[PDB]
Design a protein around this nucleic acid. Structure first.
Lengths: 217, 144, 111, 87, 185
RNA sequence: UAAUUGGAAUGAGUACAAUGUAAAUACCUUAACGAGGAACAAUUGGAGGGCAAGUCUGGUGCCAGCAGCCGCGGUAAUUCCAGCUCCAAUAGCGUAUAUUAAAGUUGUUGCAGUUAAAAAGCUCGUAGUUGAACUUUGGGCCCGGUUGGCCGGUCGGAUUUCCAACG
């Protein structure tokens, strides 16, 4: 079935790493998607756009299909992957693989007094990709996701209950808007709130503890 | 920075600068020049009645090659002469000279529509009844 | 299926089978949508509902020799006049919706 | 970060750079976790007992990673007379 | 020159007209509640959007604001009384979580159906407007009555209605009449 | 895919009455009539995309026309004219003009000016806008340090407490 080629892949297959927050805390480069199929199951996907791109040749036009898919289970984890291919079906399959490998954590928070199980984002965060800036604003309870039907659909898979948006630039370029929203939610752990001022003892990497399980034989 | 004044006692400059740059706006100018009253064929109105002078055939612009079956109309309240398109087929038979038609805008707020060159108006009512009714045989044109 | 139980089974529960249908709303029914998978996964040749042996011969006369023409008959059932042409004697794969409109427009009760 | 009843949320708490005190993001692949052996009499580095420093990928790209460890390790007694406060 | 009559409209059309998510989210709200049209659904979300605007206004203000305390309890006890907010959910963070579903539950067109005696959610709608159900002592034929908490023991057939006694109506009365003139004599 | 059947319920209406009212009309009540597809029969716009819903059939053949915009039509039209089917809102729905949101396309919040529209040829200069730094700490109680010692516990550094005031 799955024969791992990466040291991180061997530790996940051996069950020595059981949560994906171990990877995210040590910034480990995920190289194969079967790592995070056995580590984030119940992670649905949805294809957001299929459009053709053409390169013109001496004889005719070389058309092939770009696919934008997003993944995320429903809680804390988002993945966006873009792939072009000769067939629409092949681009979606390959796009899902790229979508998984780019899974990231989102930091969720409270707009106000904290009454358990955060609904909104912790801060105001922005993200830009090619003249499209997407701003994400924390919203009070019961607001829902106030966004475009594609950007809202990415924040549904994120796990955000209530959020506001602004936008700028040519948002009709759907790839640049989704890439700008992916940057905006990935920056939620970028921002250092006063919650995080306290020092930590710098834990030891699982690749460094379980070293002989990771190493090949 | 940023090329505009920012000082707290500088509201006059910002207010007069906003005023001067409002004139670059298309509809702010027409609201404050009264262009609808003086220049537009309807006197700033949604509708106007007219009198049919002749049946016209206007060639559709590229890439369409039809004949558009419009009429030339002179208004009552102004005397101005406008060209108005006669909608879906057979309606040019229902319109004749001197039928006292009713006109409306043609959708685009003072601009031509579709492949018709230089027509900004359409007929709604002819002889005071309708064109929908006459086209659908729901009413009958008065004998005139 | 049709009001036999779908109101009787809804006694203060209000959710059993409330999922959405396939979702065309003008493309025709799925009467062979089950058979479409079987011919896809079976790696040989299968015979597609071979012929119309006597429903061709007997019902062409009862329909069309009465008053009508196939150019007329295909116009009221809304199909091309070659569709009825291959329902005349032979050379068709009979689907349900076309054969149903063939029956209810001209009465002869042979399926 | 916690709720009203003190129950912890925020599924992981991130590492922070030991030079510039900034968050190591989950996609900072230029960030580095330096492990330094602890030693005792007659050498013989003790296995599995470290002195650990984390450096963010911003610092390493700027070229400050060497000067940072010289400060970060001299203050821990790992070095002497290598890093000087007054330039 | 007589003083004006105040009036207002009680619904709002959604911004984007043709969805496949919102247009098919009417599976519940029109087939599973037996409703006339989308205006009965747009009406509920209008009042529900009116609720959150007041609640968001209060939450911004300081805790132990006398304005927050006064209009807070008033907003809770009004929503408690009609039975849309549950018995202990009484907090301004929970009126914002209040959704469209538990408003259509409190309608008399469904409360008739849930309290037996209707055998369908839009058999109940027919019975209400045919002057059959009375609440307390009062016949109501408004399917959007929004019953209170001390009223579910008082949905019952009307003292005038044929199903509450009182000399059955003109169909059976005439139907028994023609058997009287055919079989009786 | 219907298709044949049954008892039940009701008001839209026709109205004795009473009520209402200055007098009436109407409402709210109410005796007597008042539902089986023929009616007591819901429309208005759409079905390429935006934008929900047919690559079904007949006609036409860059003609007629549609089409807010992109576009459709020159002999197999998912777009015209029709039939069927379906979609949207619904006693309401379409069309025209204006206006607001959209519009961060008027920008105080909050635009842009190298090349997309836009830095005066350059400098002086009045009004206008803007302009370096500097001028003393009296109520009490709880909290953190930073100096001052009464205090070393200890092999030059290791804990802090009772007391000033030091903000």
């Amino acid at each position: 079935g799955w024969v791992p080629v990466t040291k991180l892949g061997r530790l996940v297959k051996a069950g020595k790493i059981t949560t994906i927050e171990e990877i995210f805390l040590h910034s480990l480069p995920v190289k194969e998607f079967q790592i995070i199929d056995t580590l984030l199951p119940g992670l649905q996907d949805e294809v957001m756009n299929i459009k053709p791109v053409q390169k013109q040749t001496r004889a005719g036009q070389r058309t092939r299909f770009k696919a934008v898919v997003v993944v995320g289970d429903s809680n804390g984890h988002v993945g966006l992957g873009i792939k072009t291919a000769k067939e629409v079906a092949g681009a979606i399959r390959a796009g899902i693989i790229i979508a998984k490998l780019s899974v990231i954590p989102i930091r969720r928070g409270y707009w106000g007094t904290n009454l358990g199980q955060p609904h909104s984002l912790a801060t105001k965060t922005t993200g830009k990709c090619g003249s499209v800036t997407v701003r994400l604003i924390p919203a009070p309870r019961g607001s829902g996701i106030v966004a475009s039907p594609a950007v809202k659909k990415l924040l549904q898979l994120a796990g955000v209950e209530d959020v506001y948006t602004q936008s700028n630039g040519k948002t009709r370029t759907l790839e640049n808007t989704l890439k700008a929203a992916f940057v905006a939610i990935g920056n939620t752990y970028g921002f250092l709130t006063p919650n995080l001022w306290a020092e930590q003892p710098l834990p030891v990497s699982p690749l460094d503890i379980y070293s002989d399980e990771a190493s090949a034989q | 920075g940023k090329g505009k004044p920012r000082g707290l006692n500088s509201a006059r400059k910002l207010r007069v600068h906003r005023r001067n740059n409002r004139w670059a706006e298309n509809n702010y100018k027409k609201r404050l020049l009264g262009t609808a009253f003086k220049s537009s064929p309807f006197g700033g109105s949604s509708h106007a009645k007219g009198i049919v002078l002749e049946k016209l055939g206007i060639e559709s612009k590229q890439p369409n090659s039809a004949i558009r079956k419009c009429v030339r109309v002179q208004l009552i309240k102004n005397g101005k002469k406008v060209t108005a398109f006669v909608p879906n087929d057979g309606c040019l038979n229902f319109v004749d000279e001197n039928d006292e038609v009713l006109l409306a805008g043609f959708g685009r707020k003072g601009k031509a529509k579709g492949d018709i060159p230089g027509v900004r108006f359409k007929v709604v009512k002819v002889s005071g009844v309708s064109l929908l009714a006459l086209w659908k045989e729901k009413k009958e044109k008065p004998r005139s | 299926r049709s009001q036999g139980q779908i109101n009787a089974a809804r006694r203060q529960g209000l959710v059993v089978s409330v999922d959405k249908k396939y979702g065309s709303t003008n493309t025709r029914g799925d009467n062979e949508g089950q058979r479409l998978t079987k011919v896809d996964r079976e790696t040989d040749i299968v015979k597609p509902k071979k012929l119309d042996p006597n429903v061709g011969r007997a019902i062409s006369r009862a329909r069309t020799d009465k008053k009508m023409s196939q150019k007329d008959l295909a116009t009221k059932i809304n199909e091309k006049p070659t569709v009825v042409n291959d329902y005349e004697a032979a050379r068709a794969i009979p689907n349900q919706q076309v054969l149903s409109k063939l029956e209810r427009a001209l009465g002869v009760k042979l399926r | 970060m916690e709720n009203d009843k003190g129950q912890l949320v925020e599924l992981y708490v991130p590492r922070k750079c030991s030079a510039t005190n900034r968050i190591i993001k989950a996609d900072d692949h230029a960030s580095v976790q330096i492990n330094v052996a602890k030693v005792d009499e007659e050498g013989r580095a003790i296995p599995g007992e470290y002195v650990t420093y984390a450096l963010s990928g911003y610092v390493r790209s700027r070229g400050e990673s060497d000067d940072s460890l010289n400060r970060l390790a001299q203050n821990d007694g790992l070095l002497k007379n290598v890093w000087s406060y007054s330039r | 020159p007589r003083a004006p009559r105040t009036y207002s409209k009680t619904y709002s059309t959604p911004k984007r007209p043709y969805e496949s998510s919102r247009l098919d989210a009417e599976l519940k709200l029109a087939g599973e509640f037996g409703l006339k049209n989308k205006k009965e659904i747009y009406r509920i979300s209008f009042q529900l959007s009116k609720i959150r605007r007041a609640a968001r206004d209060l939450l911004t203000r300081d805790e132990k604001d006398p304005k927050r305390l006064f209009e807070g309890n008033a907003l809770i006890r009004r929503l408690v009384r009609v039975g849309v907010l549950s018995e202990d959910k009484k907090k301004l963070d929970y009126v914002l979580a209040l959704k469209v579903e538990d408003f259509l539950e409190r309608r008399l067109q469904t409360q008739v159906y849930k309290l037996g005696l209707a055998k369908s959610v839009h058999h109940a709608r027919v019975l209400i407007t045919q002057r059959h159900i009375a609440v307390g002592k009062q016949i109501v034929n408004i399917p959007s009555f929004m019953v209170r908490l001390d009223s579910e023991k008082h949905i019952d057939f009307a003292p005038t209605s044929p199903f509450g006694g009182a000399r059955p109506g003109r169909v059976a009365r005439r139907n028994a009449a023609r058997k009287a003139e055919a079989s009786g004599e």
